[PDB]
Design a protein around this nucleic acid. Structure first.
Ligand code: D3T
Ligand code: MG
Ligand code: MG
Ligand code: MG
Lengths: 105, 698
DNA sequence: CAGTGGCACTGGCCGTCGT
DNA sequence: CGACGGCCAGTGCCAC
């Protein structure tokens, strides 16, 4: 149920998605990124309806992250109407993510 | 004989004040200090030694002290002071001849820790005096609360400076006696600290006389400098910078940027097993920060109200990997390698450290399916070359533009006997590695150095350049040494038309240059593959060529054997080296000096390169001497000026075409004189060219 | 088993020094 | 805390 983004589809799928979109900037070679991956799969379901979960692999899509000053991964950006509503970096836990989401949704 | 040294307020280029001097006279066995107001007395003491037919010893005086005194004498006392060349001795020159297998800091210009091998102690001391003096001066100030500035330790005279001046002479005196004790250069029956200058030069090994004349002449060349076209090089810099920008633009469009981990401190461990995973990027586990902030009231601290959100950005215990955004850098062999393997390139050759080799050779051979990237390879090659030019001409620490002096010339430094074989070394900047006219941008680079860029002090008319180069020098040296094996056969054949052009044809090589790098690589022991690479083929073509030229003149084998027989007793490889048992580990140079041999294999190269080096050294010396005896004056206020000496070629500035014609003819006379002087078995020759700059004169 | 040299640029590493 | 510089191996290419 997660959306796999690309540099060319990021503008319309995120910035013009109209609704809350949680973007996870990751890389196959990051320990923390592999940790939070399963958490995201479950979050995608539970929050289905009030939240869309999308992922952007910074290796395959090197053009988007820079625009957002990515300094560490995994980076979790919560977009709402083309605007970054909230940002959080680190492999949060299922609970911590839910906490972060419910507080910004 | 006296030993001296001075302390002044700056390097030669801008020195304007004599601070102090010290003189140790062997006849009185005493030291005498001269303070700033004793300058005239100091000078008188030096001239008294000259008038007595005596000798004056300095450590690096040929390049500094002697010329410095001439300058200071004119500025401060409006006095003409010119110590004669034959009355001076330089322990640095002596030390570089006797301990030629060793390196030195070039008087503190080079960091000792960066040099290979060992360093002579006394010389090390003298070379570090300025640094140690500055350290002393600096702490003393900070002990007084006062701050330290740029290099104020040289602005004024003080007693610490005096003490150091004294130390230099005692150390220089010890160094001198250490060098004089070498029986190979100085006959034991003579006490060289108690003889007139004529005896000193005549009784010591020829090499001692040659080295001092070379140093004295080359110091002068440094002072002359090489007229440089600053304007033309700045315009070249602009053009190159633009080309670099465009290449970067295109390359960065082809090869995108990426993220790399950077800044990680902690080790990433398996969340289940807890096993450390060293191969995974280092991470960072923030110890502070949560989803919300701390509660600031009732029903917040009691979980009733919302509770302020933590805008921070991190969460305690939530690990992440710190990364940096990297932009493709055409100058980074690491980046080139990354992007090309990501394009399907499969590296064949790697360095003896794992990294894949990324030189022009492999780049030229690389193949990838994406035509755009395949094309990017040429852009990368061009970019790398553009950088070398930019670095050497404008951006490098030793860039020509950073070295142009006010007199519009570059005063490159020369270590007269810096190479083990007796060759000179050049630096600051290295005027012996200017791109050749046939390489990219070579003509512009070369033409920027030239007599034309110097306008006569009186007429304002540009000077003319006389370039002279010894003809196939090292091959003629080979002919000489193997004449005892082939009765001068090669020595006669080599004169039948240009030797390199002849070889080029016989070898079927594209250029005369290629022929040169071929014949020398061959003559000096290059392997079959190494030869193949040189001509552009493989180990196969290598063997054919090597056997064809060795067949032609088998005496090469004979010469190689006698050298071996003479030097080696036995040898063997242990692991990554060949341990050798020597009979003698040095060759007797043409002027009698010991020439240290690094390996049995490079021996022939030591013999021939040294011979060519000493021939050329005596050559530039005799050439200037023959010109002076012809009434010509050496200097910009004269008729000619040495601008550069590059192994077997000299570039001389001349006030007129007529003088240039005489410089060229005299150079040829001097070379033949040198050949006769050492009973050379091969006729020696030079080729000269008159022109405005280096592009036309070489 | 080419040899002699100088020197530029990248990327590591670490201590001084301003945010 | 992190930008930045002197020191350093690695690598390469320039000249002869
Ligand atoms: C280029 C080169 C040169 N050498 C040595 C041995 C020769 C001297 C002088 O070189 P030069 O080009 O003048 O050669 P030279 O024979 O004097 O040719 P000219 O007649 O001056 O052109 O340097 C070497 O060992 N390896 C090389 O690749
Ligand atoms: Mg001195
Ligand atoms: Mg030559
Ligand atoms: Mg030459």
């Amino acid at each position: 149920k997660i959306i796999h983004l690309t540099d060319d589809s990021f503008d319309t799928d995120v910035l013009k998605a109209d609704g809350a979109i949680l973007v996870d900037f990751w890389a196959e070679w990051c320990g923390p990124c592999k940790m939070i991956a399963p958490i995201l799969d479950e979050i995608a379901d539970e929050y289905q309806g009030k939240l869309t979960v999308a992922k952007l692999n910074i290796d395959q899509n090197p053009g988007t992250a820079p625009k957002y000053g990515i300094r560490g991964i995994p980076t979790l950006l919560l977009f709402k109407n083309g605007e970054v509503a909230a940002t959080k970096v680190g492999a949060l836990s299922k609970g911590q993510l839910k906490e972060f989401l419910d507080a910004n949704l | 004989m006296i030993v001296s040294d001075i302390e002044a307020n700056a390097l030669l280029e801008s020195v304007t004040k004599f601070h102090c001097g010290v003189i140790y006279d062997y006849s009185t066995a005493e030291y005498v200090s001269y303070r700033p107001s004793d300058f005239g007395a100091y000078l008188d003491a030096l001239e008294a030694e000259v008038a007595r037919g005596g000798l004056i010893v300095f450590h690096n005086g040929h390049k500094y002290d002697v010329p410095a005194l001439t300058k200071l004498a004119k500025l401060q006392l409006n006095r003409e002071f010119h110590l004669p060349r034959e009355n001076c001795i330089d322990t640095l020159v002596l030390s570089r001849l006797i301990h030629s297998n060793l390196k030195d800091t070039d008087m503190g210009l080079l960091r000792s820790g960066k040099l290979p091998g060992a360093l002579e102690a006394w010389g090390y001391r003298l070379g570090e005096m300025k640094g140690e003096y500055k350290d002393d001066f600096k702490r003393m100030l900070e002990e007084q609360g006062e701050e330290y500035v740029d290099g104020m330790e040289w602005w004024n005279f003080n007693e610490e400076m005096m003490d150091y001046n004294v130390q230099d002479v005692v150390v220089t005196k010890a160094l001198l006696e250490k060098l004089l004790s070498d029986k190979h250069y100085f006959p034991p029956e003579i006490d060289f600290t108690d003889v007139g200058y004529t005896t000193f030069w005549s009784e010591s090994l020829e090499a001692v006389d040659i080295e001092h004349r070379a140093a004295w002449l080359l110091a002068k060349q440094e002072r002359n400098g090489f007229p440089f076209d600053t304007k033309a090089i700045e315009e070249l810099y602009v053009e190159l910078a633009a080309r670099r920008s465009e290449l970067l633009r295109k390359l960065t469009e082809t090869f995108g940027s990426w993220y790399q981990p950077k800044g990680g401190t902690e080790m990433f461990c398996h969340p289940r097993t807890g096993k450390p995973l060293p191969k995974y990027p280092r991470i960072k586990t923030p110890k502070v920060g949560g989803i919300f902030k701390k509660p600031k009231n009732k029903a917040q601290r009691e979980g009733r109200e919302p509770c302020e959100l933590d805008t921070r950005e991190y969460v305690a215990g939530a690990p992440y990997t710190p990364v940096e955004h990297v932009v493709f850098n055409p100058s980074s062999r690491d980046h080139i390698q990354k992007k090309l393997q990501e394009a399907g390139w499969v590296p064949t050759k790697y360095t003896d450290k794992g990294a894949p080799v990324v030189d022009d050779e492999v780049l030229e051979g690389v193949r990838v399916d994406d035509p755009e990237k395949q094309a990017a390879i040429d852009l990368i090659k061009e970019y790398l070359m553009i950088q070398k030019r930019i670095g050497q001409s404008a951006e490098g620490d030793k860039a020509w533009l950073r070295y142009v002096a006010e007199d519009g010339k570059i005063h490159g430094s020369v270590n007269p006997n810096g190479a083990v074989t007796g060759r000179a070394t050049h630096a600051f900047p290295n005027l012996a590695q200017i791109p050749g006219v046939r390489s990219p941008y070579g003509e512009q680079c070369r033409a920027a150095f030239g007599a034309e860029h110097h306008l006569d002090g009186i007429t304002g008319k540009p000077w003319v350049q006389a370039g002279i180069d010894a003809s196939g020098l090292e091959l003629r040296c080979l002919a000489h040494f193997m004449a005892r094996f082939d009765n001068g056969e090669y020595a006669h054949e080599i004169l039948n038309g240009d030797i390199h052009t002849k070889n080029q044809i016989a070898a079927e090589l594209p250029t005369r240059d290629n022929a040169k790098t071929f014949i020398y690589g061959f003559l000096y022991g290059a392997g079959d593959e190494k030869i193949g690479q040189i001509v552009g083929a493989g180990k196969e073509r290598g063997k054919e060529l090597k056997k064809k030229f060795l067949e032609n003149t088998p005496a090469i084998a004979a010469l190689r054997e006698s050298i071996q027989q003479t030097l080696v007793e036995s040898s063997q490889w242990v692991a990554g080296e060949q341990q050798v048992k020597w009979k003698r580990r040095w060759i007797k140079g043409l002027d009698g000096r010991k020439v240290h041999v690094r390996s049995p294999h490079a021996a022939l190269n030591t013999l021939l390169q040294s011979a060519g080096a000493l021939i050329c050294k005596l050559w530039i010396i005799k050439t200037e001497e023959m010109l002076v005896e012809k009434g010509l004056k050496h200097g910009w206020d004269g008729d000619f000026a040495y601008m550069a000496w590059v192994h077997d070629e000299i570039q001389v500035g001349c006030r007129t075409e007529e003088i240039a014609q005489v410089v060229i003819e005299t150079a040829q006379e001097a070379m033949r004189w040198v050949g006769d002087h050492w009973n050379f078995r091969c006729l020696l020759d030079t080729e000269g060219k008159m022109g405005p700059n280096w592009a036309i004169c070489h």
